[PDB]
Amino acid sequence: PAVADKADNAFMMICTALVLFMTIPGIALFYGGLIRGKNVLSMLTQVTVTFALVCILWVVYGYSLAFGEGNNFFGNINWLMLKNIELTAVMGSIYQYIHVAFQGSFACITVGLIVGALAERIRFSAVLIFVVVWLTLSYIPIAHMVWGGGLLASHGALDFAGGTVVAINAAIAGLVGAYLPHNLPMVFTGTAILYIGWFGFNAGSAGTANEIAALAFVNTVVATAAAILGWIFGEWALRGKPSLLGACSGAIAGLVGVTPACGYIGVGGALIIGVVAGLAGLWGVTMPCDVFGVHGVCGIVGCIMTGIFAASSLGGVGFAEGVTMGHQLLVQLESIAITIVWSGVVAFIGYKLADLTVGLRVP
Amino acid sequence: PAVADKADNAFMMICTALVLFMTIPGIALFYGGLIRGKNVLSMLTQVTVTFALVCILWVVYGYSLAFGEGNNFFGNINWLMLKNIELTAVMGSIYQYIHVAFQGSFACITVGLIVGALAERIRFSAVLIFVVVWLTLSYIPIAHMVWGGGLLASHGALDFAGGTVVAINAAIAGLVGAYLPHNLPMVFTGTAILYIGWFGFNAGSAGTANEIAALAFVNTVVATAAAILGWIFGEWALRGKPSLLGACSGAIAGLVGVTPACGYIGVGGALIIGVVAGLAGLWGVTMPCDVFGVHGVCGIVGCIMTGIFAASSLGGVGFAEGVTMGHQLLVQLESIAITIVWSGVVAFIGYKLADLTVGLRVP
Amino acid sequence: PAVADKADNAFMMICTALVLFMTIPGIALFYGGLIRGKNVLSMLTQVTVTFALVCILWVVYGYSLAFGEGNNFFGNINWLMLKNIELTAVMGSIYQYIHVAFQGSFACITVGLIVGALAERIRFSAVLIFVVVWLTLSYIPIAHMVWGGGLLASHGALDFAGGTVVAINAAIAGLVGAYLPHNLPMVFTGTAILYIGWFGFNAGSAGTANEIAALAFVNTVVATAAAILGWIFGEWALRGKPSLLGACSGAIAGLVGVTPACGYIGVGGALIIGVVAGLAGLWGVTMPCDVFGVHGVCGIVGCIMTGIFAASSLGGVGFAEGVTMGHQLLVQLESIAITIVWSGVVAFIGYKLADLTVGLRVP
């Protein structure tokens, strides 16, 4: 039976630490610099407490429901509090315990993205109700569909590190919420921490320290850099001069945009995707909930452009056998639509259930 | 003869970097946000300078006296400035040089915990005298007894990553000192950095990237999360609402509390220990020297509960052969008592020697 | 043919992340705390945007020109946008893609050092012109000469991690620029981040997680610590008392000073070099462009003292066969002189070309 590679265990434990770093303190510092000063302490408390909450649900049933074998949409409850996972159980080339932690860290940042923005406007008890509903009925199933052999995986969807599961998912939940900057040095710092953490998010998504981790790494560096220049250029062109928030936003645009693609494309495609994401990001925000705007627009762009740049002819690792580019594009579009709709319905339901129970707006 | 595993070398060099990160800037930023503004620069200077000092003593004689073979209480002086350690010498499954650095990083954070709190009130020259006395006569011997095959090890004490050597040790030295918040975003940031660094502290304590590192990792995530919720819940129950400092304190409570236990217990036990530590932490502080209160109370709780949750029947890795739970508990209690008393006497002696030499209170 | 070691791939991807961390946000936070408050946002924007720029040039032609095989001074254009690098191509014991990223991260921090200081005083378009000229005509060739088998390598120059390529190179470019503190907690934080990142910079320079990485690690800890004490002592002796900025500056002095030496010397030599660098650093600044003063003086000192402490007799790894200490010293001095002069001429040319094109001073 399959044995764990200690190089892969080491790499993926470090990568997990780096993705946890994106939430505590990365996204908290990012939002903390954007939202109103009088609301900062409260937002940091909600982000910390709901981080804790997601860690606990994850171990309790969340991992089992996302990565256990179930149906197209849901796993199982065989792995309650990780029961029936032998300590020496291997998954891929690493101990399954490490897989549990790595996967849970992506749940954390996804919820962090939502809670940092709406903490300002949502009653504390209502944010907790929301997180439970939405993590369970939206993050878990969509993680299952994409990474847990569910519906979208079984149709060949390409999403290396979570254009759909993290970015579009959170953008939508966040925008349904929206519907219902005071310290820029602090914003830069959280962007920097998000950037560094994002190497574990992207490279670690290979599940091993191989050439695919290596390619995801370099593509992360290249797409972020290109998106920064693309945003800044567009800001200089429209606004006369670059801005710090413009630079940071560009960095996030390329990161988001390269997320579904990093392990599939060539550096040339990483560059193109970075430029397009930076401009699309800028275009989008022109039309702190802007954050969901960048994530949504840039994650859509990234997801689509994965179905293009994965092609061998464009420097990519190649589509699966018998899969033309037109097919892959169709599948990317279907994954994106399912994610938008599934997350929105569940977001809507989470917000309504909170509102009926405790009320939504902060008193 | 034993050969180094490059996966283990890589893992443990990264883990060391992460534990150094807990001090520079983690604990400095933590205290910097708590202590009075007019005292911050001075505290950061003392924490930086005494960090340097501990790094130097460690290489000079400290490593040799803690990890050389000696008696029950002290090692030797065979390893002055690491003499007689061949560059290719292996210890466990890593080069001994890496062991030297990893172990020294735990000395650093231990002293950081003490100096950040009392820098406010202690003359600079007096803090330096103190660090030399206490590192040498308390941290070194207790490290030797627990991790260097001394007294407590030879009786089977369980302390995976330093409930006794770091937490209770520093709590006591700190409280003997005490006897003789202005920027909460900064407090959150150092808590976040302590949390991330704490994965190298806990996982790296396996000495290898194996299933025990993996288990220590997951248990770290789970106990911190549970302690956060446990503290916050108790604060909501007693104070009407959660607070940011409450959340951060809870995070530290679970971290401390899971420290002696992380590599020995199951996630179920990690959860229980996290909840208890969060509440005990809150209970303790109710009765910035609060920091030593959490470390002391939570490290005592963690140390005791290791002697319980290590049991195979409760999901743990199992006690040694022929060791009943009652026995392990007795040994945990004896280790805790020896640490409290040994550290206190030496703390007291360090403070008195400083006071007689240069005087203790800042002029 | 040579196969990649996954332990080395993991180690070096993490090390790269750590060196990128030194720039984003390390050096930005360092300068941000030093320069005038009204200039901070602008400096952070320029550091972020030129970081992006260096990442892009690097992938486009920069890597190929530095590490392709060419002549004594320049590589080639065989590796445009990494063309002709097979994804599974190995270099040393890691995938070449990882080598590309690791090497590019050193270009980034080098430019970060220059731009953080002069952003205050240089027109944005002029800093971009400058970076292109200087990275291409100075950083690339000097990287080629030292690490890409060019002139200085072929004569046996010792520079483990970039006393010449990074520190002296940037000091000079920076001082030619100069010729033509408001938040100390923020300065400490960036110093801390530079320190932690510097373990990937120094240890990762072994190209593998072996005993040399291990030695570079420990030597980093020891030289930084010793330089901190050496600076602080000199400040106490001259100024009556230590200061936070004094402590941070000392830390940077030892780091810079041990950079060319870390993988070649013994811990005893690491200690000596640390003390000398801390004092020389202090001496130098006595005679935020001080930053280039420390880097220049301390990098010169470090480079020279590598040619001394590498000796087997002084605990070092040993000079190459047939190389006496006097010879190695001669070669170190020649490398230092070539770097000073090459960088200055190119710096001067970059500043003049910018000035003739867009003008240099901020309007």
* Helix/strand/coil (H/E/C) assignment for every residue in B237-302: HHHCCCCHHHHHHHHHHHHHHHCCCCCCCCHHHHHHHHHHHHHHHHHHHHCCCHHHHHHHHHHHHH
Residues B60, B45: Cα–Cα separation, whole Å: 23
Give, for C91, the enclosing helix (H) or strand (E).
Answer: strand C90-91
C7 touches chain A (CB under 8 A): yes
Kindly give, in sequence order, each residue whose CB lies less than 8 Å from that of residue A34, ignoring residues fewer than 6 positions away.
A181, A182, A187, A288, A291
Burial of A220: CB neighbours in 10 Å, binned 0-12, 13-18, 19+: buried
Q: Which among A75, A72, A74, A77 has a CA at the least distance from the CA of A60?
A: A77
Judging contacts by C-beta atoms under 8 Å, the chain B residues touching residue C184 are 41, 44
HSE value, Cβ hemisphere, 13 Å, CA-based, for C110: 31
Residues A138, A95: Cα–Cα separation, whole Å: 27
Answer whether B213 sits within 8 Å of A41, measured CB to CB. no
User: For B231-270, b where at least 16 C-beta lie within 10 A, e where not — what string?
Assistant: bbbbbbeeeeebbbbbbbbbbbbbbbbbbbbbbbbbbbbb
Kindly give the residue spans of alpha helices, DSSP state H, lying in chain A: 6-21, 28-34, 40-57, 63-67, 96-118, 124-134, 140-147, 151-154, 169-179, 184-203, 211-239, 244-258, 267-286, 290-309, 325-357
Q: What letter would DSSP give residue C347?
A: H
Give the strand pairing for C94-95 and B94-95. unpaired
After which residues is chain B discontinuous, taking C to N > 2.5 Å? 180, 287
Judging contacts by C-beta atoms under 8 Å, the chain C residues touching residue A199 are 13, 16-17, 20
Residues A3, B245: Cα–Cα separation, whole Å: 43
Pair B132, B139: CB distance under 8 Å: no
Count CB neighbours of B322 within 10 A: 7
Three-state SS string across C125-186, please? HHHHHHHHHHHHHHHHHHHHHHHCCCHHHHCCCCCCCCHHHHHHHHHHHHHHHHHCCCCHHH
User: CA-CA distances (angstroms) from residue A62 to A167, A316, B88?
Assistant: 19, 33, 45
> Residue C262 — left, alpha, or beta (φ > 0 → left; ψ -120 to 50 → alpha)?
alpha
Domains in chain B (CATH in brackets) are 1-363 (1.10.3430.10)
Residue A176 phi/psi, 5° resolution?
Answer: -60, -35
Nearest Cβ partner of A25 from B189, B200, B268? B189
Nearest Cβ partner of B56 from C184, C185, C225? C225
Burial of C362: CB neighbours in 10 Å, binned 0-12, 13-18, 19+: middle
Answer whether B48 sits within 8 Å of C226, measured CB to CB. no
Q: Which residues pair with A33 in a beta bridge?
A: none
Kindly give the residue spans of alpha helices, DSSP state H, lying in C22-118: 28-34, 40-57, 63-67, 96-118
Judging contacts by C-beta atoms under 8 Å, the chain C residues touching residue B55 are 221-222, 224-225
Stretch 117-136 of chain A: residues touching chain B, C-beta under 8 Å: 124
Judging contacts by C-beta atoms under 8 Å, the chain A residues touching residue C28 are 188, 192
Cα distance from C183 to chain A (closest Cα, Å)?
12
> Residue B277 — left, alpha, or beta (φ > 0 → left; ψ -120 to 50 → alpha)?
alpha
User: CA-CA distances (angstroms) from residue B32 to B23, B43, B120, B182?
Assistant: 12, 7, 11, 9
Residues C213, B9: Cα–Cα separation, whole Å: 9
Count CB neighbours of A360 within 10 A: 21
Complete DSSP assignment for C64-86: HHHHSS-SSS---STTGGGTT--
- Angle between helix axes A244-258 and A184-203 (nearest 10 degrees) is 20
- Angle between helix axes B6-21 and A6-21 (nearest 10 degrees) is 20
Residue B94 phi/psi, 5° resolution?
Answer: -130, 155
Q: Considering only alpha carbons, which residue of chain A is nearest residue B183?
A: A41
Judging contacts by C-beta atoms under 8 Å, the chain B residues touching residue C217 are 13, 16, 97-98, 101
Q: Which among B224, B238, B341 has a CA at the least distance from the CA of B287?
A: B238
Q: Which among B158, B116, B111, B136 has a CA at the least distance from the CA of B57?
A: B136
Q: What technique solved it? A: X-ray
Q: Which residues pair with C250 in a beta bridge?
A: none
Pair B106, B16: CB distance under 8 Å: no
Residues C292, C270: Cα–Cα separation, whole Å: 22
A10 touches chain B (CB under 8 A): yes
Q: Which among C164, C231, C222 has a CA at the least distance from the CA of C195?
A: C222
Q: Which residues pair with A122 in a beta bridge?
A: A361
Answer whether B211 sits within 8 Å of A32, measured CB to CB. no
User: CA-CA distances (angstroms) from residue C123 to A161, B98, B254, C115, C126?
Assistant: 39, 46, 50, 11, 5
Q: Which among B220, B218, B243, B219 has a CA at the least distance from the CA of B232?
A: B243
**The dihedral sign for the CA sequence B140, B144, B150, B151:** positive
Q: Which among A175, A244, A242, A238 has a CA at the least distance from the CA of A34?
A: A244
Judging contacts by C-beta atoms under 8 Å, the chain C residues touching residue B186 are 185
User: For C134-168, b where at least 16 C-beta lie within 10 A, e where not — what string?
Assistant: bbbbbbbbbbbbbbbbbbbbeeebbbbbbbbbbbb
CA dihedral B25→B26→B29→B30, nearest 10 degrees, is -160
Q: Which among A198, A196, A294, A228 has a CA at the least distance from the CA of C45?
A: A228
Kindly give, in sequence order, each residue whose CB lies less than 8 Å from that of residue C330, ignoring residues fewer than 6 positions away.
none
Give, for A289, the enclosing helix (H) or strand (E).
Answer: none
Residues A263, A318: Cα–Cα separation, whole Å: 11
Cα distance from A46 to chain B (closest Cα, Å)?
9
Pair A347, A134: CB distance under 8 Å: yes
Kindly give, in sequence order, each residue whose CB lies less than 8 Å from that of residue C263, ignoring residues fewer than 6 positions away.
C160, C161, C202, C205, C206, C212, C215, C216, C219, C317
Give, for C363, the enclosing helix (H) or strand (E).
Answer: none
3-state secondary structure of A122: strand
Residues C25, A193: Cα–Cα separation, whole Å: 8
Cα distance from B230 to chain A (closest Cα, Å)?
10
Pair B25, C197: CB distance under 8 Å: no
After which residues is chain A discontinuous, taking C to N > 2.5 Å? 180, 287
| Cα–Cα–Cα angle for B169, B173, B177, rounded to 5 degrees | 160
User: For A265-277, b where at least 16 C-beta lie within 10 A, e where not — what string?
Assistant: bbbbbbbbbbbbb
Pair A223, A257: CB distance under 8 Å: yes
Q: Considering only alpha carbons, which residue of chain B is nearest residue C184?
A: B41
Cα(first)–Cα(last) distance of chain C, in Å? 57
Q: In chain C, helix, strand, coil percent, each to 5? A: 75, 0, 25
Q: Considering only alpha carbons, which residue of chain A is nearest residue C33?
A: A185
Residues in chain A, total: 363
3-state secondary structure of C117: helix
Burial of A325: CB neighbours in 10 Å, binned 0-12, 13-18, 19+: middle
> Most C CBs within 10 Å: which of A219, A267, A271, A314, as the mutation test of the C interface?
A267
CA A160 to chain centre: 11
C48 touches chain A (CB under 8 A): yes
Resolution (in Å) of the shown entry? 2.1
User: For B40-49, b where at least 16 C-beta lie within 10 A, e where not — what string?
Assistant: bbbbbbbbbb
Judging contacts by C-beta atoms under 8 Å, the chain A residues touching residue B314 are none
Asked, as a colleague might, if the bond just before C25 is cis with ω within 30 of 0, I would say: yes
Nearest Cβ partner of B242 from A13, A29, A45? A45
Residues A229, A250: Cα–Cα separation, whole Å: 7
Residue B220: what residue type?
T
Answer whether C221 sits within 8 Å of B10, measured CB to CB. no
Residues B289, B180: Cα–Cα separation, whole Å: 12
